[PDB]
Amino acid sequence: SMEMDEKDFAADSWSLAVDSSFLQQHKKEVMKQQDVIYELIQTELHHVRTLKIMTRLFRTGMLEELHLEPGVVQGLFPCVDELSDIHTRFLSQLLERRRQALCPGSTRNFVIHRLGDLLISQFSGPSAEQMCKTYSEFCSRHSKALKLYKELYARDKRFQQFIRKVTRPAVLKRHGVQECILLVTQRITKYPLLISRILQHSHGIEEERQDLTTALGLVKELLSNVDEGIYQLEK
Amino acid sequence: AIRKKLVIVGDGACGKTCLLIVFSKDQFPEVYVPTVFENYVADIEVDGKQVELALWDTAGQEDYDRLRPLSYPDTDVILMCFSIDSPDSLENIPEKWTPEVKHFCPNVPIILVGNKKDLRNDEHTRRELAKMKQEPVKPEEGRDMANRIGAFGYMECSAKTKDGVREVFEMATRAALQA
Numbered sequence A: 001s002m003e004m005d006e007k008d009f010a011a012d013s014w015s016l017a018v019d020s021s022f023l024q025q026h027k028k029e030v031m032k033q034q035d036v037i038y039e040l041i042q043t044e045l046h047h048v049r050t051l052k053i054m055t056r057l058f059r060t061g062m063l064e065e066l067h068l069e070p071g072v073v074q075g076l077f078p079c080v081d082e083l084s085d086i087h088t089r090f091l092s093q094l095l096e097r098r099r100q101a102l103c104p105g106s107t108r109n110f111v112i113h114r115l116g117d118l119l120i121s122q123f124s125g126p127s128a129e130q131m132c133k134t135y136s137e138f139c140s141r142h143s144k145a146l147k148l149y150k151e152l153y154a155r156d157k158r159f160q161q162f163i164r165k166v167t168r169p170a171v172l173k174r175h176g177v178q179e180c181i182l183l184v185t186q187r188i189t190k191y192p193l194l195i196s197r198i199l200q201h202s203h204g205i206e207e208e209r210q211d212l213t214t215a216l217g218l219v220k221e222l223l224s225n226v227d228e229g230i231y232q233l234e235k
Numbered sequence B: 001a002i003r004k005k006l007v008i009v010g011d012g013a014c015g016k017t018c019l020l021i022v023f024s025k026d027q028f029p030e031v032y033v034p035t036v037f038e039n040y041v042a043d044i045e046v047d048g049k050q051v052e053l054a055l056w057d058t059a060g061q062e063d064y065d066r067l068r069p070l071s072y073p074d075t076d077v078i079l080m081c082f083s084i085d086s087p088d089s090l091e092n093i094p095e096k097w098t099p100e101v102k103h104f105c106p107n108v109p110i111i112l113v114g115n116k117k118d119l120r121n122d123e124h125t126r127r128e129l130a131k132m133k134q135e136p137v138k139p140e141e142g143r144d145m146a147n148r149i150g151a152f153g154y155m156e157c158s159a160k161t162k163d164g165v166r167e168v169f170e171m172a173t174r175a176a177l178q179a
């Protein structure tokens, strides 16, 4: 994660992120809609930070510091590069839409009027197919990854030392190997919850209410195929 | 410091997300209540034992029967939640949630938690329930359900007022420690 985005999403809400004099110039329904859009971007930034801890810190750390058997790191961190690519492109698009919405002379005051189009593009066509195929794979290999992690920690002493060492920072308190896998699996089921609450405060522009309804249907369609595609593998 | 895992389960609007948020949050959500909960590792000291309690939510997983069970591995205590302003969510506790929790988590202690206890004497809640020929869940109805499902215990709390929240999570830590 980068300091710039960490500060832009450091506040507990959109109402606390913007200047109080900018906040006071908006209708309460706009403040409420913006609070949920901000939460969607904030949690997507956290999701991408989770995937980067998995690729750079755990996955790459194990290759460069451990003599683990080939294919064991793949079994521990399935499809993490693919997942990292998908969500980093999505975060990039949400972050640019926020920057576009910035008030000239400000780096914090913005109001996003269009979001549904970005959500429709992400959860439709080839991009939705790629997430469907990737989350179906990741979730079918989830239990085997936890079991493989547990075996390695119970039999290898150098693997124990590596884990103790990388997970020592307080910033990684809720981000151990198993926590990262459950965080990733649980991510996709957050989208309908976030999009429905955004849609609830988006009845000002009818093209937006329809766009957010198309995207809500598209995410639920995706989750149903990801759920149907799950077939748990064993160690 | 031992690591223990807590998972909260229950119907859509049982208040499980609000409960996790109010507990993990240093202060109370005065300005914005978040839509979702990611995870949290709490430092709890109960009866002289120092524990690291990882907290997980199943909100959003209710309709996905092959995805939801991925939340269960290595759980040490289950909070089985229902809403006191919704007697229909209590009927689903033994029919839907208990067979699932016992199949995936055999021998894991379950605490049956009645959330939103403040709505028991709320006027709009009692009027809406009377149209449905119903009333808020009585304390003895919750205890009778906890007894019938073989729960470790029964507890009530209000995430809105914070009453009973700290006691639920300390008891969950005690239940997780017992072997």
Ligand SMILES: COc1ccccc1NC(C)=O
Residues within 6 Å of the ligand: A019, A021, A022, A025, A102, A103, A104, A105, A106, A109
């Ligand atoms: C006009 O609204 C504001 C109030 C206080 C500070 C800044 C602004 N406007 C921008 C565009 O930043």
